[PDB]
């Protein structure tokens, strides 16, 4: 009933960004929130009916329009000094606070486009001691050193995606958690039977989709431009 687009947003500081929210539930009231790890949800703007808007406690540096019932666009301007956050749109009936939320969008804003780096990806092979102990084989994938924390990890075996046996970290982790300025890592486990791992015709791949620079972003550095891209690593069955 509610669309936000896109899932991930990357911008250099000073650049205005408009986040879309569209709604087909025929709701009068619409809401924008920001979500920060130490806070839950904070109201940015509330629009109870078309053309009406009221500022939340943290509307400083934000702008909204409501010319149509079905859309509530949020602009984040240069005047917001801490714009990195997860932004959620919601809607409700006019005389209610029972809300229905969009999927949210991750906005990350950086001082410099040169601070973007794609993940490195590595797969660690199942321990032979695990295999003899449990008759099971756990592969581990590590994606490391990336910024922004905008990634989606998947496992592919013999070219088909799998979900059974997969356990991925719910969110990327700061490699320097005690500090503002940090890159990110993400881990995932795929556990299969020993027999399946021990078949050399089985090929296991960890694939990480990175969301980074776009082709209208300019790049002059020697290193490969850190565009949105997929980074992959593989380990193949071993008949030990």
């Amino acid at each position: 009933g509610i669309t936000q687009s896109p899932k991930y947003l990357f911008r250099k500081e000073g650049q205005n960004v408009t986040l879309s929210c569209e709604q087909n539930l025929n709701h009068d009231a619409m809401y924008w929130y920001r979500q920060d790890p130490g806070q839950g949800l904070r109201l940015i703007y509330y629009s109870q009916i078309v053309n009406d808007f009221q500022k939340g406690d943290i509307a400083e540096g934000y702008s909204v329009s409501r010319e149509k019932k079905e859309s509530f666009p949020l602009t984040v301007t240069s005047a917001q000094k801490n714009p990195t956050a997860f932004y959620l749109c919601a809607s409700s009936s006019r005389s209610s606070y029972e809300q229905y939320f969009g999927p949210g969008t991750r906005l990350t804003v950086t001082e410099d486009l040169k601070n973007v780096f794609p993940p490195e990806v590595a797969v660690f092979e199942p321990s032979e001691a695990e295999i003899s102990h449990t008759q099971k084989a756990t592969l581990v994938c590590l994606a490391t050193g990336f910024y922004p924390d905008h990634v989606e990890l998947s496992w592919w075996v013999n070219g088909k995606e799998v979900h059974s046996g997969v356990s991925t970290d719910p969110q990327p982790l700061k490699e320097q958690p005690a500090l503002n300025d940090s890159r990110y890592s993400l881990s995932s486990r795929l556990r299969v039977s020993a027999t399946f791992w021990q078949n050399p015709r089985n090929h296991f791949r960890c694939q990480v989709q990175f969301y980074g620079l776009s082709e209208n972003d300019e790049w002059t550095q020697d290193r490969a431009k850190p565009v949105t891209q997929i980074v992959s690593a593989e380990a193949w069955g071993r008949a030990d």
């Binding site: 606070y97 029972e98 756990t138 890592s185």
Partner: protein, 184 residues
């Protein structure tokens, strides 16, 4: 004005019951509960409207206190799928809707025949860095710098870009249980 949620974090075994709380300084007209998965939109679970009201929706039971300043959320027989952030929200005649910070619930899947062990795995490309895998531990296991790196289901991984990094170091002073299988 002030909406408080307790406990801030809760880690429990599959099958356990639990109750979490929403406490207000001020009277609410209504109170809503939401569940949110990481990087997803909160999903509405209930609205309570009348002081004393109890609403049972399947394995979930909600109460609004008589004075309309407090609410409980109770889950019977918690499942791995109940994992998420439970949010409380309300307003009261000032009509400023306020959100709590949430309770983050983590439900650990059952493990009827535990086999806690720490393994070391090698990189496929063999830069010969390794990771440490702690796995097959029960729900009563809870998992020295920003260098030694850790990820907490029933497994945890650790890694580091130092050479003196040993798996014995990454998983101890921690809570590996008494009969952990720890191969060289």
């Amino acid at each position: 004005q002030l909406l408080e949620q307790s406990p801030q974090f809760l880690s429990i075994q599959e099958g356990e019951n639990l109750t979490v709380y929403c406490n207000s300084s001020s009277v609410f007209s209504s109170l809503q509960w939401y569940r949110q998965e990481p990087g997803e939109g909160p999903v509405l679970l209930v609205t309570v409207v009348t002081g004393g009201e109890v609403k049972k929706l399947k394995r979930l039971t909600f109460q609004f206190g008589d004075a309309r300043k407090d609410s409980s959320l109770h889950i019977t027989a918690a499942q791995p799928g109940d994992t998420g952030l439970y949010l409380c929200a309300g307003a009261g005649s000032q009509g400023n809707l306020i959100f709590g910070k949430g309770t983050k619930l983590s439900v650990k899947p059952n493990i009827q025949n535990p086999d806690p062990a720490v393994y070391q795995l090698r990189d496929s490309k063999s830069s010969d860095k390794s990771v440490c895998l702690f796995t097959d531990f029960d729900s009563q296991t809870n998992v020295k710098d920003s260098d030694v790196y850790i990820t907490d289901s029933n497994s945890a991984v650790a890694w580091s870009n130092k050479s003196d990094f040993a798996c014995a170091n990454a998983f101890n002073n921690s809570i590996i249980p008494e009969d952990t299988f720890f191969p060289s």
